[PDB]
């Protein structure tokens, strides 16, 4: 495995439902690679939120920020990385979505008020899954 995920920081958390996701990603690349990394963020209520390409992959330990666009109960976000279109790591988080204030939570409206939803990504409980792939 040439590339390894070393850590993820969920920077803006808690945030509003409509706020973008700002992640700090730390990874290590042991050797020179021919192709691109693609980092992807997926919403699971389902829809791909955003992605970012890194190419050529800088060797060594690298730290970067990934700003993913927002989407449109408890839900899940998946942060994955692929090399040359082959997925080798995935990090899943559970997300608690609740209303701003006491009365909205107890008496929620029929037509949901997106602007009053605060999401809280449970960043201490990531599910990390690795897959072995061909590299170069």
């Amino acid at each position, epitope marked *: 495995s040439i590339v390894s995920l070393l850590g993820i920081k969920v920077l803006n958390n808690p*945030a509003k439902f409509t706020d973008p996701y700002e992640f700090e990603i730390t990874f290590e690349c042991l050797e020179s690679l021919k192709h691109d990394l693609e980092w992807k963020l997926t919403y699971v209520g389902d829809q791909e939120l955003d992605s970012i390409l890194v190419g050529p992959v800088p060797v060594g330990v690298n730290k970067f920020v990934f700003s993913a666009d927002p989407p449109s109960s408890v839900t899940v976000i998946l942060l994955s990385c692929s090399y040359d279109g082959r997925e080798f790591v995935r990090v899943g988080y559970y997300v608690n979505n609740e209303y701003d204030e006491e009365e909205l939570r107890e008496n929620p409206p029929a037509k949901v008020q997106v602007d009053h939803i605060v999401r809280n990504i449970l960043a201490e409980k990531p599910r990390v899954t690795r897959f072995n792939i061909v590299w170069d």
Partner: antibody
Amino acid sequence: VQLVESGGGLVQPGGSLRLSCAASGFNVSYSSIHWVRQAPGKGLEWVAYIYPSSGYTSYADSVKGRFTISADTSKNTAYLQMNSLRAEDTAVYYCARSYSTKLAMDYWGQGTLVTVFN
Amino acid sequence: DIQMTQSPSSLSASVGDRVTITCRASQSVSSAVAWYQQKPGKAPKLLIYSASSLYSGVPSRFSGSRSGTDFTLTISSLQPEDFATYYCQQSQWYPITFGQGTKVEIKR
């Protein structure tokens, strides 16, 4: 939306100084607060940022280990604690806000001067 | 480690001219690039973010574009208030870095 800085002025090498950044018109919890400095006649230099929501920070190589950024959400205010000051830290220090701009700074304070004199 | 190499350091132009400022990322950057305007003794002001998104209230004659690792700021038709210093910025990689800046001065 205002960012008001305070705490600048004169200080000696090795001494310390605390800058404040009071925010009005928005909740700092939903943004990141940044410090940018500009030495006299020089270009902009990014210093540090903090996400008050998570407490996560980042420091420029020139100040890491010497400056510490922090925030108090209940007061809607951010701080830059500057220790082990050197002459080259003399500069105008700006406070700035980033919100939904991929860490671009959309609002800036007017700046406060920090002068390190022997 | 990443550098944002901004060029030219200065350029002379006239009212109405189309000017171009370039800023080269030393390694790949997706979109987290911004452009700022600073006038003497004043706080900088955000013009472009996300490489090409015009910030609210900024005149449309400022536009940002990209070609590979080259990030460009274009001022179509300079106005007298546009003569100033301009800075690029990247905020994808640690650490956030500004370019060295470009003076846009008046030709006479």
